[PDB]
């Protein structure tokens, strides 16, 4: 699909260069339709992935029930409304129910959904739901903090603005003590 | 004979939780309850949109009496008994 | 043994339900289908069942127990029963 | 002295159980096997037993006390009993 | 309408006391001298009086209600009354 | 005046015990040995005794009061009495 | 309106020219020739929020996501004008809300800040108006708004407390009724 | 021109709609319905520097002063677009100059950053265009320009070096010839 | 437990395996910079796994004191260096330990020594975290123990997902640190 | 240069050597947590040394464009392997150069860091190789390279100096001959 | 209590012991840099243990005011320098004290002087923390006292485990600081 | 150099002197908390002065290899003041310019350990590290900067809690060429 659609993406980017008043034949722009098309395919590579392949059977037994957190996961996504990046960090916490996920898989799960055309809220929920369904834990908490370039480089132009979204499932929603421990430990 | 009902945050408004997976299906139907499973939870629950005062009056007509009422976290719970 | 203390945490609709301590009536614990455990770091054993508390309350009424009081403390919901 | 207040902290299945204050009935405190102490910085004396509260409640029923109310406050579980 | 829920926040000695909701008996609300309001952002109307809860409880006894239970939840003290 | 509310904070074994509000029965407050005060910033007066709540409960029983309910709210332990 | 702006511009410039003379300055010196007009235009821009309505600002950016989770837009730069002294007060606005199946466009929360902050104001009113506008536009479970600002009237003059900052808070719906929702919001805006 | 923008907007929207389909997405889903138009408008805003000229931007804000001392406008937020990948590169611009007889209006130094940054660019060219525009407009003793930027093409993809930053530097007139002037500039922009 | 005699006997086998790895990577084991590498890499790996040579009893060394002490004791910011058992690559960070004594008080340094027994092994963060908490619980029989481990896994930064800033935080709360949220909150406030 | 064919042919030999290491350390290669370790450790090691599969020409990919300014790419995350102990040394690389008619693609400076750092190395060699590769590819007026790294061999073992950092510097062409060019570079990389 | 006369009488014995230490380390007590060391090291050790010369009553010096204040008083970031009794090596850090007065308010500086009485001794952190809290409790009879000590032990950084960043935090909460979690939370929030 | 046989023979003398110090301070060496203190204090003092047992040649091991600036900075340093027998602690930053011989990175830290684990004065310690590197490698030049907190100035005496001593030694091109020294001081920040 990527190979077949690459010329169509490059034709659209070349057309955009002309429609902006630019010269697609100028040295600095000659390869731009192809490079922009490849970059856009990389930014949306999460559509190529499934949870099962990403997990790669990296689920292990851990009888003792302790909170596990993977925080400060760098996240790079694309706003679906403007096709402009929104970037930041994801902090994930969960309380296992005898099954523990491979540490890196929590970051790989962030990669499946972040590398798509998105809205922060949907992205946050998808990460929490994927972990819930893969591990069946007592609960999951996900916090996403991001700078949307559509609010800084244009529009409202609020230089310091940041969006924070939160999803708390299972014991992370029902038990405030579990949620408080998670929020204290991700600082 | 025992029933547990609850509401969160404010007592004047619903939803009111009125049952679990093993609750009497006829009583749940009588109250107009819906069944759901909140995300990440390992259990189903029955709930109504009515505030708890309305549910308590409906349960009295079914032979239930409030034995105890308690607060726990942000949840207000009533324990009823069919005397 | 007239008094009984039972409890559940976080949500009232689902177990586990704590139904006893080390000196609880072994026959009553066996009747409820309770298991004995000692949570790590604790200086005591406890009995528990997988049933939600509403099921345990109905079973206890059939054994002569009646709820005297119900209270919340932290994230624990407790019932104090009496064999009257 | 018709009223009695007893309490336990953190878990209901294990002691210590507080069973009295400075002006509590000394014979009842002796009967329960209670010791007297003052926690550092406190402006009062308390009586306590090593037994979990369920054991104390059974002993108090044999002395004519009945549980009127049970409540949680902070991390303390309290019973209010009355000699009737 | 046999059940009634009343409440106060922060201190028990002073009002306001919440005495009803949208579907409360309008004659009983008028009898208590209650006003109707909707706090900003809330999806419901409430009835309240300026009186402390002890005064409301005495007035409700003269209308046939008895206190069945009293509980704390957060910073709210709640009474559940029943017309018997 | 059938209802009474009494309370204590932090520990149940020691006073002060709050035994009334501005509209409390002055004779009952005098009988308990209560003093009247208004804590800074408060919009109300209160009556209190130095006695622990167990002593106050025994005194109120001799006046016809019975404990209907006892509850915790924050760091306050409250008793609702009735005569 | 923009017609009101054009019509009132000469009146504002005449008032600013009069202020320059009353302060002992020379409105004819090079550095002050265009000042009546530039000060008038700046003051119109600082009060442009009077020209806006919530409906136009929202621009139908209300979506349907099955979201029942906390959404926050924090560190929104805010520039307002004190109505008592006509001197700026500047800072940050942090907004949180719990949707009720209607989710607002992220930028619209900052646009709502712009409607009310670009006016002659008091911090308390500005804070409340932002919370009430979001509540009425979305009908959510609750809204929380925190405004932190330096008032130049307290630093450049008057009391001259260089480090002083005013913090105002408004909590509506579940943000007021449920302390746990308010605590999660305050923890996440740090 | 703004007429060119209106005429080309449907062509840009058609190309963005085509990109949505070519990526495997559904242009008919709620979240994407207006995206071809919104993405087209955002791209026109990111490249609005092509609509400007130095003369209009300067707006005759050149004052005559006996000032022959260093003037710096630092930490000017800059948002540009890489011409190779059509992905943003963002950061700060620090400008210094030694006036001869003419001093430029402070805000015009930031407006000059906007003329060139709001284009498809390469950081080196951007840096040089800012310095040359100031040199030609004012004829000063010298100009120094430092641009520090994060390129999203090196962070979100490719080498994926999360902390990498590009710093370019242009020093003209006395800023090149006199190391003491350039050292004062670099010390004062920290 | 692994002995110093086992180390001497297995050192040539480890050096032969590391020399083989150098050849299999396309490198020249005979070049100056690599001549002593089979032996140096083998010694480094034995040092990184020296925790297998230790016992809790030897590490404690009877450093248990008596006291009418019922107050919170914390040893925080203990530098920790471990080896991921899945990739044989380091994971490094800090360990913060808290406990509420029950008449027995552990010697301050022993808490860091307990971190050393378990961290100097082929591990997983979760196992390491519970082993430290369980060792303190069994040695002292306290009212409770809390252990927080924060670590950077080099397998998530130098390779794989390559998330430069990612950190794993694991927590174990036993006894009163689990049962009493007020004790756990005091611990978490004091380790900041 | 090493190839994916050599990689796949040597993978079983690497896995056999890692399995042998597990047994020689006193561990049980049959326990659940260690079953796939010989293969995962082998793959990780060939990724850490993937620099032997590369050449400067392929990495540059003809990204040489046709300036009078200092160009710097700083804070490039670097992950290498100490050749003496086979333990990581990690940190940052800061590169500066003065072009001479040829300007290198920004990302290639980070790609050049990747060729040499993904090998068994010594910090001094790595620093010099990066500077020499840029010098030969571009023929600029000069190049400056600063590498700062934590060696895990000095923190996790040996001397165990937790805060120790190695800083190596290479200055070629005008970066060596002209102290003013070197000073500008060192000031701009802070 | 140790007196200034005891100090003068024991100074030559301390100097003889320090001179013996110089010889036992392989050093030359006659070299210029070491000639006065037995005397200076002896004086320094007497200063580090000067807390044995003091009593709470003298230190308080009647600085107890009867202003009925019913609000929280804190003296935080009090620099603390003590000596480990097990190794005779310093442990240094900060003490943060909070109390809720009943009918008596203590003079601000006396809270720091109380830290000086107990810290200038051969100690163990736990005991030091408890002694400061008990001294304030007995001197003022307040509603409650909270004491937090944070210290770096040089025995855990310069030697032994050699954990460069390790810090010990000890806490003592008496009266309402133990019984009321809200009072303890206000104290811990205000000492940050 | 001090030997392990000397350590076994002198360890009881150190312990006997610390037992005597405990008595002379008014303390009870027989109380539970002090019983092991004479031996522990003795062992701690031997460890603090273990640098007298070491020579540069043993430390140099297999770590010399055959013209760019090399720096090892933020080397944690723990020494003992020779005037009061109280620790002074901080960091050492070393820079050198090789001349056909490069030293193993770790050995620069080991050299710090030989001289810091002794009774010292900051100035002598700083000079000894620079001289040892100069004689071992014969480089173009060496620069050594020591920053330390002296506990004798913070726990007693003047009691200046923020005071820090910074000493510097510049040899060869680090002294003769100000451009080399400036590059060193810029890179150690
Ligand atoms: N809740 C949510 N909303 C999201 C994203 C990403 C983007 N959006 C928001 O879509 C709205 C589109 O509005 P619109 O049609 O009026 O466009 P436009 O004139 O260009 O707007 P503006 O930018 O204000 O100039 C904006 O409000 C934008 O913020 C997300 O993750 N979560
Ligand atoms: N609550 C509130 N108050 C606000 C603003 C903005 C301003 N103000 C306050 O109006 C008061 C005016 O008093 P006044 O007449 O005495 O003036 P003046 O002598 O000049 O005062 P001063 O400044 O002391 O010299 C001041 O107290 C000022 O602070 C706001 O946002 N919220
Ligand atoms: N000097 C300079 N260079 C610039 C920009 C903007 C971009 N570039 C650089 O053009 C090069 C294009 O090379 P390429 O064909 O190989 O592309 P591609 O495979 O996608 O690259 P990569 O990113 O490595 O994956 C890259 O090196 C890129 O960094 C700038 O401002 N200044
Ligand atoms: N819970 C836990 N998990 C741990 C460690 C240490 C490592 N792991 C995790 O083992 C998983 C192995 O998966 P795998 O077989 O697919 O390997 P591989 O393709 O190389 O993976 P990747 O790294 O993604 O490229 C990974 O998820 C890794 O993170 C720990 O302490 N706790
Ligand atoms: N110049 C330079 N030196 C480097 C590296 C990488 C490593 N090395 C150094 O090689 C030396 C080898 O000596 P050795 O045989 O005695 O080893 P070993 O006993 O294990 O040492 P130690 O660590 O002290 O225990 C060490 O000094 C090590 O630091 C580098 O990048 N640049
Ligand atoms: N609770 C508490 N413990 C304290 C102090 C001061 C010191 N200690 C601890 O006494 C223990 C003595 O043990 P030991 O005999 O085995 O000595 P030694 O081999 O030298 O040990 P080590 O240092 O590991 O080499 C050590 O654990 C030390 O930390 C304090 O204030 N509170
Ligand atoms: N240059 C140098 N000097 C050093 C050390 C270590 C210590 N010293 C200094 O010897 C002097 C001793 O003097 P003294 O005899 O008068 O002692 P004493 O009354 O106890 O002094 P004091 O501490 O003031 O109370 C002090 O000045 C001390 O600072 C070092 O590294 N470098
Ligand atoms: N989790 C509930 C409390 C609760 C505990 C136990 C049973 C029922 C409810 C709350 O925080 O509101
Ligand atoms: N520790 C319990 C509360 C509790 C206290 C006392 C007895 C029983 C339970 C909780 O946090 O949920
Ligand atoms: N201080 C008790 C609560 C309590 C208040 C009032 C009376 C009794 C107990 C706790 O935190 O557990
Ligand atoms: N929200 C109330 C508690 C409450 C929960 C449920 C019903 C009624 C009240 C409070 O914080 O005070
Ligand atoms: N404010 C009381 C709680 C309370 C609420 C309502 C009525 C009475 C008491 C406390 O924190 O202890
Ligand atoms: Zn957008
Ligand atoms: Zn003002
Ligand atoms: Zn690019
Ligand atoms: Zn790994
Ligand atoms: Zn090494
Ligand atoms: Zn010690
Ligand atoms: Zn000294």
Author numbering:
A (entry chain B): 63 to 249
B (entry chain b): 2 to 84
C (entry chain a), D (entry chain e), E (entry chain c): 1 to 84
F (entry chain d): 1 to 83
G (entry chain C), H (entry chain I): 60 to 249
I (entry chain A), K (entry chain E): 58 to 249
J (entry chain J): 58 to 123, 126 to 249
L (entry chain F): 58 to 123, 127 to 249
Reproduce the article's own wording on this structure.
Guanosine triphosphate (GTP) cyclohydrolase I (GCH1) (EC:3.5.4.16) catalyzes the conversion of GTP to dihydroneopterin triphosphate (H2NTP). This reaction is the first and rate-limiting step involved in the de novo synthesis of tetrahydrobiopterin (BH4). The effects of GFRP on GCH1 occur via formation of heteromeric protein complexes between GCH1 and GFRP, which are dependent on the intracellular concentrations of the effector molecules phenylalanine or BH4. GCH1−GFRP complexes consist of one GCH1 decamer flanked by two pentameric GFRP complexes.
Complex formation with GFRP-Phe leads to increased activity at lower substrate concentrations and eliminates substrate cooperativity. R216 is part of this region and, in substrate analog complexed states, coordinates the β- and γ-phosphate of GTP variants and contributes to the charge compensation of the triphosphate moiety. Concerning GCH1 stimulation by GFRP, from enzyme kinetics, we know that GFRP-Phe merely reduces the positive cooperativity of GCH1 and, as a result, slightly stimulates the enzyme’s activity in the presence of subsaturating concentrations of GTP without an effect on Vmax. GFRP seems to help stabilize the active conformation in each of the 10 individual active sites of GCH1, thereby reducing the cooperativity between the active sites and allowing for independent binding of substrate.
